[PDB]
Amino acid sequence: NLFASFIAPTILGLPAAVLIILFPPLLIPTSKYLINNRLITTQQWLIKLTSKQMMTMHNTKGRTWSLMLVSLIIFIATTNLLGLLPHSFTPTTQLSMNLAMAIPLWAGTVIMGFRSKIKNALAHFLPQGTPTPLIPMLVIIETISLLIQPMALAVRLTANITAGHLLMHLIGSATLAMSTINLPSTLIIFTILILLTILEIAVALIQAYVFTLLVSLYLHDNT
Amino acid sequence: EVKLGELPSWILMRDFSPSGIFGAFQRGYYRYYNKYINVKKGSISGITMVLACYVLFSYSFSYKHLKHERLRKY
Amino acid sequence: VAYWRQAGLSYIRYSQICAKAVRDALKTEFKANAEKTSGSNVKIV
Amino acid sequence: LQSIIKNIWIPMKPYYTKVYQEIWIGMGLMGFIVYKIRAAD
Amino acid sequence: DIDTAAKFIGAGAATVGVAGSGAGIGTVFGSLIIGYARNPSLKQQLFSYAILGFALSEAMGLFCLMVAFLILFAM
Amino acid sequence: DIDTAAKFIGAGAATVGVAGSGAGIGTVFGSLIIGYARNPSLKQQLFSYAILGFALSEAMGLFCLMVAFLILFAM
């Protein structure tokens, strides 16, 4: 009854969760022209400013992912922002979807660190200026954290959009309860919901930039 | 095309193929895109009208849940 | 980075106003003597 | 079914073959996890 | 029931970990105030670090709300 | 009886998480004193960062009163 906005949506027995995951790309029109409209002029600028941010820090092999790590910050920042609409089912609150964006991009990042350049990837586990006599303890950290980075991504994003929606939905129910009670209090609980919606707008973008930065930093440490 | 027709045969006149109704969306998209989005000096209302038709859809499947929270019973 | 450095000035221009301010607050017994021992006469071509 | 080659795979050809080759090796790992998680449930 | 009663103790104890991330957001947004009064020309590059420090510290608090809700509701 | 009792043990133990927001607000308004004594011309630019760092502390302080509420009322 409380987690209702996270159950897979179905209308007329049809799994409507597919027309919701495939919609974000519909808000990004493209054109071959040279001078287009305001939408594609602002979007092609954001993609320019974004790609120059995540990708500048990479070498030539890391920059071959400049289509992936840009088409990923565009898909997470548009799925989150389409979740703040009323009653909307944002599929980034799903541990299934988030585990499907996290494991491949991570596994495909350490594999290229183990299928090639492996002898160099063996040197990140042991920092440069490290004395020896307590190495058999540090080996646990750099591996067990590596083995849990793919689950850090998918849960840092799941637990931040879920908890952001749960809070806005509870504080919302508060204003509904104090509506039939002292009303000058309703307006102070509501203005908390407004400052909270401006926060959930920012955390809708920040959680997209951090997800695609930590996938970038994993890549930078394997190319 | 409709908005000037009057017959119930038009419902069966159309091309109801897997490629048929797609061309009715791809033409229904370019008729909208060209009207509100694909103009210089376009306004934000080309988008805030898609979201408004995306909430009504996000609410339509979410009505089977909100009905358990009515504050009346009649 | 102070505000004047953001405003284009340099520490020489900063010091010229701070030192002018001290002399402008000197008393008349010393203000005449102090102004000519530090006044400027050089000129740019 | 043409232009599914030209519009849909001709562009993605240099990526789906060379660049994302190790992605799929990871995407197999993921599919093994999802089925296993659903197998124990 | 002692099993359903022990859920409220763990769930209420699990969410104490949000005290950590509530104290690391004051360090970040406190360091931004210090680091911006020393090089106010870097205003945009510092704020791009207050953001990464915000989300990576706050994330560690929600890992406690995860177990606060994994216990309280989903056993 | 134990079910309605195990809530005060879980509710009170959940409003501890706002301790972190008492230290996060200290470090924020503690760096506004250090950052303003360094560049007293940015008194209005820094103070707007302190209000931002202070507001974001209530954010992680509310995530606790939520789980302190659910345990208490909406079990």
Added chain:
Amino acid sequence: DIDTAAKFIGAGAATVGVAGSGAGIGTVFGSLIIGYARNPSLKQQLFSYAILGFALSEAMGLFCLMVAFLILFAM
């Protein structure tokens, strides 16, 4: 009566939240001693930010004493 016994551990554990407002008033008046040593000319304006930063951190501390005095006396 396991009811009023759980109202003791509630107030007893809900008052641990004051450990934040004890280490937040330490960083406000601590960083006032540091910031005032650098620019002692602003003694007045710094002390007006300490009182503002001490209260905003102590407020988040009294809210725990207000909660501990609800689970104990009100309900």
Added chain:
Amino acid sequence: DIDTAAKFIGAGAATVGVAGSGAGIGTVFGSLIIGYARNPSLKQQLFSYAILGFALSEAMGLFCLMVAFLILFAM
């Protein structure tokens, strides 16, 4: 009786609030050392801040001992 057993865990948990006033006095008398080593000509004024800052820090720490000695003995 269980109340006599709950008053012990209620008090033994309230005294954890003193852990704040123990890290908040190390930040006041730790920022007097950093603040005095810089400008040692203000020793008689930096100190009279490290007494206000030390009194406003143990105050929020002795509340948690007053609460302990209010649960443990005095109802």
Added chain:
Amino acid sequence: DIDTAAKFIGAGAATVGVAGSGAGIGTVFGSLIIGYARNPSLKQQLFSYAILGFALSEAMGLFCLMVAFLILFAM
């Protein structure tokens, strides 16, 4: 009966050790902001330490989260 009830309390306590990493990652990215604003020509080498610090503080917090589950699920 109680052997499972204790696995909801022992797991709710183990997961509060993550609060030590919500404050660690804040100190790491609260120093990447200060340290940068002083020497902004070492951005490539400071960030390479803020990541080493973010990974080593998070690696301690996630030990708690692993003992949280290794108690709640394995034994």
Added chain:
Amino acid sequence: DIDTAAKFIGAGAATVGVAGSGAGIGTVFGSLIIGYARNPSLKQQLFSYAILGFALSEAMGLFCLMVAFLILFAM
């Protein structure tokens, strides 16, 4: 006997306030290093502040161990 067994919890939980002092002594003797690495000709007077700070925080770390020994044996 539920009370004699409760004393082992209230006395084992009161002694975690010591973790506040132990963190406010590393701040003091970590500020004595930052304040002596700047003005080392003050080594005499700094060390007479790193003892007033060490002996004022570690007094709060003893008020906790005072209640830990007040519940464990004095009752």
Added chain:
Amino acid sequence: DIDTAAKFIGAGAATVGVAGSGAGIGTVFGSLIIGYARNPSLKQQLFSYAILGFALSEAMGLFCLMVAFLILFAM
């Protein structure tokens, strides 16, 4: 049983000591950024102090994880 039950709250609360080594590794690797932004020509000697501080703070974390795995499987 009540032994196999309480040995989960014990080994589940003993592992909160890792919350120390979470914020001790965040300060060591946080101040290493500030120690390097100041004197980058000592990068080899600084990083050898960070690894000493990372191995002595984490060792206090292991001493807690060592106890939780002592009152669980050893005895």
Added chain:
Amino acid sequence: DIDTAAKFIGAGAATVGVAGSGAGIGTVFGSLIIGYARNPSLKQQLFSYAILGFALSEAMGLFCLMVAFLILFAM
């Protein structure tokens, strides 16, 4: 029995005190890197304080690992 059960909860909640001896050892060696990078001419005398601070904050951690091994083995 009920005692041998609570003896594990008290000895577990007491060794959380090490969480303050892990944030101290972190701040001491966090200032040894900052203080030595500022005045590297004092390497031998700054390090002679970072050993005192290491031993004095870790002395409050032993006070908790001692009261843990008192309820656990002595009584």
Added chain:
Amino acid sequence: MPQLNTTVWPTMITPMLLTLFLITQLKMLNTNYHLPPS
């Protein structure tokens, strides 16, 4: 927690892969930045 109902996971995994990897990228390959002229 309804995220754990693993019966509707393949309904979230496949339409994501069909978007993150084929439809969103295809629309990026159409966004090109020509080099400036003399």
Added chain:
Amino acid sequence: QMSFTFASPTQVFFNGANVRQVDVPTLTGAFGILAAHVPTLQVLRPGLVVVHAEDGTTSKYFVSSGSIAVNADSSVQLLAEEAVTLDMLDLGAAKANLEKAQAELVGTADEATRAEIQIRIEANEALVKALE
């Protein structure tokens, strides 16, 4: 151990003298300088300079600009562009010119020529607090 050197462009106050402490108004905030102080180098802002002779007896000059440079061998070189002892400044013109400076700012809006007013304002603001 300290080798002070305080000198105006036209006057020398100390030269190689052994004072125990100086309190200078650096732009990054004032600090006091005893022997073996960490090597630094700064630039002053208007404010006092208190010089503590070995006898514990002070001496108070009002510098206006310049650059102090503590060195590795405990030598100090304080150079003030205009360093007048407090027995030469007056309180009336400081408060008056500060008003003529403050009142002239509000009538100005250009970033450059208003920046030169604030520097004159703080130079006079630091004057009234030095005299009394």
